[PDB]
């Protein structure tokens, strides 16, 4: 069937759609199609292209109200401007200076504000099941289902640790801590990465 209405979606509405590049772009919802119990959403993008997308690959073009976001919520976020999919790992609280922690689909982690988030329209019941990278997906499943149980290592600036990267362990130094993230300076290449403090990549007890 072709539909004009589907839940709160309406043909002609402004929307964000996922492109093959994995970045998300503004468009218009031009069709809603049912195929058995399945639903597809045709989007005409503002610049280039039409795509027929599943509901987990479109997002509303507005910012979610804070109380509609949970740990595990599936979102599109400003990735640092590009828009990229992720999972909410933390909601605003005193310890994170009232920000959202996002774990992006490629494994990048960043704190963002509500103004940098868009809610996915039809997330999967298990929101992580459309994360393409299996390693990332498994990590998110464990994190979201274990929450609020979050084993983390307590790190302090100046601390020398080993950190994993590309399958090996690198001499490194804790530069800064920001909520549940730690900025690690890798001594070999003198470059930094922000890493979640519950990451098994962090080894203080070498």
């Amino acid at each position: 069937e072709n539909l004009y209405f589907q839940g709160d979606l309406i043909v002609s509405m402004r929307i964000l759609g996922k492109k093959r590049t994995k970045t998300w772009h503004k468009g218009t919802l031009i069709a809603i199609q049912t195929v058995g119990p399945g639903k597809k959403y045709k989007v005409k993008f503002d610049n280039k292209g039409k795509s027929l997308l599943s509901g987990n690959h479109i997002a509303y073009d507005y910012h979610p109200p804070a109380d509609k976001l949970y740990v595990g919520s599936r979102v599109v976020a400003k990735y640092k401007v590009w828009l990229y999919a992720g999972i909410v790992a933390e909601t605003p609280n005193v310890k994170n200076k009232l920000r959202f922690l996002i774990f992006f689909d490629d494994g990048y982690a960043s704190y963002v504000t509500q103004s940098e988030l868009y809610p996915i329209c039809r997330p999967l019941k298990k929101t992580w099941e459309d994360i393409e990278d299996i390693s990332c997906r498994d990590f998110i499943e464990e994190y979201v289902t274990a929450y609020p149980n979050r084993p983390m290592v307590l790190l302090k600036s100046g601390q020398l640790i080993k950190t994993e990267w590309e399958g090996t362990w690198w001499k490194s130094r804790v530069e800064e801590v920001d909520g549940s993230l730690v900025r690690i300076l890798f001594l070999d290449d003198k470059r930094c990465e922000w890493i979640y403090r519950g990451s098994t990549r962090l080894e203080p007890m070498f």
Binding site: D106, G107, Y108, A109, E164, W165, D189, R191, E193, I195, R201
Partner: peptide
Amino acid sequence: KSTX
């Protein structure tokens, strides 16, 4: 440099 990639995340990770």
